[PDB]
Amino acid sequence: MKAWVLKRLGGPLELVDLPEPEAEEGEVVLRVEAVGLNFADHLMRLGAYLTRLHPPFIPGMEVVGVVEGRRYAALVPQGGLAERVAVPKGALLPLPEGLSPEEAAAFPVSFLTAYLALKRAQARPGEKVLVQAAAGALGTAAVQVARAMGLRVLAAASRPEKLALPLALGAEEAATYAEVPERAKAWGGLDLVLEVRGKEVEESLGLLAHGGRLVYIAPIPPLRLMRRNLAVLGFWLTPLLREGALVEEALGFLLPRLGRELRPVVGPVFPFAEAEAAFRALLDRGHTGKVVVRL
């Protein structure tokens, strides 16, 4: 089969022929239709991610494909950018009839991240939440999920031209980063902040109201947190996938809404042949939505 392999960290990808995947006991081989790319994939190629994969390896962790006539979505540790991938039956995610392969590929990581992040910060109906990079994959997903949870959303992005989408998705207000401080004050401070910028985190903390919580998805002075009983929660999706209880709960909330009130935003779609281009699109702040590779 054809597949993209990264032989060296920081190196280029290579289109190669590889042996067909062999499904071990409990696994199925799904023929890939689409692959959703994540910034995490970019960091893994540089060896700068929480998980350190040793080359050579096939990039791609968010896959959508067919198994015996039925389409499923799945999170794999690697092997995405290939014609076929072996996947544990238990990781298979059933999709609603009619969901396109592209929209399905933009769902797993973003929506699970948004929901589990808010769920962990104990977001309650009516609470005020700031969503950054609100026109991106995670952002658009965050706005929709927060809305479904009954939260009041303040979306922020870098350029005015990126604000229409988040506003359309349900945000109460959308603002450029420069104006967030004044909006937070106008809102009486925020209850939650989904931090993806990571730079001046101390500034994000200043936007929080008493009891506020920042989810970290430039050190933090432990004293600014006391005055207002603030909390900073570090977040990393991968380890959470191993917790059946959490997952089941999240899927019990997300799945019945997939294709209905929750509609993953597909961004640039690249053909299999343009894998390198798709990876660069992950770096183009200008793109909106999820970067997807279609086979």
Automatic annotation (TrEMBL):
Keywords: Nucleotide-binding, Oxidoreductase
Enzyme class: oxidoreductase
Enoyl reductase (ER) domain boundaries: 10-293
CDD domains associated with the record: QOR1 (cd08241)
E.C. numbers: 1.6.5.5
Domain of life according to the entry: Bacteria
Protein's name according to its UniProt entry: Probable quinone oxidoreductase
Originating species: Thermus thermophilus
